[PDB]
Amino acid sequence: MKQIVEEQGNKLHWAALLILMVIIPTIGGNTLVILAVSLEKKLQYATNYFLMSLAVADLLVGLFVMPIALLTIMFEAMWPLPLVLCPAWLFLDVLFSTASIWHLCAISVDRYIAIKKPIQANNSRATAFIKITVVWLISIGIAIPVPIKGIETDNPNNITCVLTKERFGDFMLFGSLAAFFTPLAIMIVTYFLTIHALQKKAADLEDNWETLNDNLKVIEKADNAAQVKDALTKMRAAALDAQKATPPKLEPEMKDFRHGFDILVGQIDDALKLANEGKVKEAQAAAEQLKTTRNAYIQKYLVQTISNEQRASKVLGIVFFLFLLMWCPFFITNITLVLCDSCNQTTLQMLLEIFVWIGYVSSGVNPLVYTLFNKTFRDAFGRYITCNYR
Numbered sequence: 606m607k608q609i610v611e612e613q614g615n616k617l618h619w620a621a622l623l624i625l626m627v628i629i630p631t632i633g634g635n636t637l638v639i640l641a642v643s644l645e646k647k648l649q650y651a652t653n654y655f656l657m658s659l660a661v662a663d664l665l666v667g668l669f670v671m672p673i674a675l676l677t678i679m680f681e682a683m684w685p686l687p688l689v690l691c692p693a694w695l696f697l698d699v700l701f702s703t704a705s706i707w708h709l710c711a712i713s714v715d716r717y718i719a720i721k722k723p724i725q726a727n728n729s730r731a732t733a734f735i736k737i738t739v740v741w742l743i744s745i746g747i748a749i750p751v752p753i754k755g756i757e758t759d760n761p762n763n764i765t766c767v768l769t770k771e772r773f774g775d776f777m778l779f780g781s782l783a784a785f786f787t788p789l790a791i792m793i794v795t796y797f798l799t800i801h802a803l804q805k806k807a808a809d810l811e812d813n814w815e816t817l818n819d820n821l822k823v824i825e826k827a828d829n830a831a832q833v834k835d836a837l838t839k840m841r842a843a844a845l846d847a848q849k850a851t852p853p854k855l856e857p858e859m860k861d862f863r864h865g866f867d868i869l870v871g872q873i874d875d876a877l878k879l880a881n882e883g884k885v886k887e888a889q890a891a892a893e894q895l896k897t898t899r900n901a902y903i904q905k906y907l908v909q910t911i912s913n914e915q916r917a918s919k920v921l922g923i924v925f926f927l928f929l930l931m932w933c934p935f936f937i938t939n940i941t942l943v944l945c946d947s948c949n950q951t952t953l954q955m956l957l958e959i960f961v962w963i964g965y966v967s968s969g970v971n972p973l974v975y976t977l978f979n980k981t982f983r984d985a986f987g988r989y990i991t992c993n994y995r
C-alpha cells in the first residue's frame with residue numbers, strides 16, 4: 606500500500622520536554638539532598654544516611670538510565686550504542702528503579718518502629734548500613750535476570766533494546782510483583798498499623814494523665830500515710846510511663862517539655878521521702894506543688910507528642926502515596942501485557958514507553974519533595990541554589 610505512509614518522523618520536542626521537566630529536576634534535586642547530608646553537620650545521623658542512599662539511587666537514574674532512555678526515542682528503530690551496553694543499561698534501569706521503591710518501604714517500616722518502640726536509639730550507624738545493604742542486595746537480585754538471560758541477538762548487529770513478552774514474559778510478571786507490588790502491600794499494612802499505633806499511644810497517654818490527677822485527689826483527701834505512699838509510687842510509674850513514649854531530647858533550640866517528668870519524678874521522690882519519715886502534713890503540701898510542674902510541662906507535652914506524631918505521619922503517607930500512585934500506570938500496564946493476549950501489544954508497548962517517564966520523575970524528585978518538609982534541609986537548599994555553602 607503506497608497510501609500507507611508510516612513517517613515516524615520526529616520526536617525531538619519530547620526529548621527537550623523530558624530534559625527540562627524530568628531529567629534536570631532529578632539530577633539537581635538529588636544533588637541537593639546529597640550536598641545537605643554531606644556538608645551540614647546538623648543533618649548527619651542514622652536516618653539521613655539511608656535517605657542519602659536513596660538520593661544516590663535516584664541520582665544514578667537521571668545520570669545513566671534516563672539519558673540513554675532518550676536515545677530510544679530519537680532512534681526508536683535500532684539500538685545505536687554498542688551491543689554490550691544494551692544489557693548493561695537494562696540492568697541499571699531495573700536496579701535503580703527497584704532500589705528507589707524498596708528504600709521507601711524500609712523508611713515506612715522504620716517510621717512505624719520509631720512510633721511503637723521509641724526506646725532504641727544510637728538505630729545506630731551499623732543498623733543503617735545493614736538496612737542500606739539489604740535494600741541494595743534485594744534490588745540486585747531482582748535486576749539480575751536481565752543481563753543473565755540477555756538480549757535476543759548470526760546478526761547484522763541489529764539490536765532492539767526491549768524486554769519482549771516472548772523472552773522475559775515470566776520476568777515482567779514476577780519481577781513487578783517483587784519490585785513494586787510486594788513493597789506496595791507492605792506499606793498498606795504498615796499504614797493501618799500506624800493508625801492503630803498512634804491511637805493506642807494517645808489512649809495510653811490519656812490514662813497516664815488521669816492516673817496523675819486522680820492520685821493527687823487521693824493524696825489531698827488522704828487521712829493515712831500508707832495511702833500517700835502507694836499514691837506517689839503509682840504517680841512515679843505513670844510519669845515514667847508517659848515519658849518513655851518519646852525519644853530523649855538528647856536525640857530544638859526552644860523549650861523541651863519532656864524534661865518536666867525528670868522534674869516531676871524528682872519532687873515525687875522527695876515527697877515520698879517525707880512520707881517515709883512520717884511527715885504527712887508536710888508531704889501533702891509538696892504534692893500540691895506537683896500541680897505547678899504539671900500545669901507547665903506535662904500538659905503541653907501530651908498535645909505536642911500526639912500532634913507532632915500525627916502531622917508527621919500524615920505528610921509521610923501523602924508523599925509515599927503519590928510516589929506509588931505515579932508508578933502504578935507502568936506496572937499495572939506491564940502486568941496486563943503478559944496476562945492479556947487479546948490486547949494489542951503494539952500500542953501496549955507504546956504506553957509503557959510513556960508511563961516509565963511518569964515513574965522516572967516520580968522516583969527522581971521523590972527525595973526532594975520528602976526533604977522539603979524539614980526546615981534544616983530547606984534552609985540548606987536555599988543557600989545551595991544561590992551557590993553560598995560555607
Ligand SMILES: CC(C)CCC[C@@H](C)[C@H]1CC[C@H]2[C@@H]3CC=C4C[C@@H](O)CC[C@]4(C)[C@H]3CC[C@]12C
Nearest residue numbers: 624628629632633634636637672989990991992
Ligand atoms: C542536558 C542535561 C541532561 C545536562 C545538564 C543538566 C545538569 C548537568 C545541570 C542542569 C542544572 C544543574 C544544577 C543547577 C543547580 C544546582 C545548584 C548548585 O548549588 C549545585 C549544582 C546544581 C544542582 C546544578 C548541577 C548540574 C545541573 C543539574
Ligand SMILES: CC[C@@H](CO)NC(=O)[C@@H]1C=C2c3cccc4[nH]cc(c34)C[C@H]2N(C)C1
Nearest residue numbers: 698699702703767768777780781784957958
Ligand atoms: C518502556 C521501555 C522498556 C523496554 O523494554 N523498558 C521497560 O519496560 C523497563 C522495565 C523495568 C522493569 C521491568 C520489570 C520489573 C521491574 N522492576 C523495576 C523495573 C522493572 C524497572 C522497569 N523499567 C523502568 C522499565
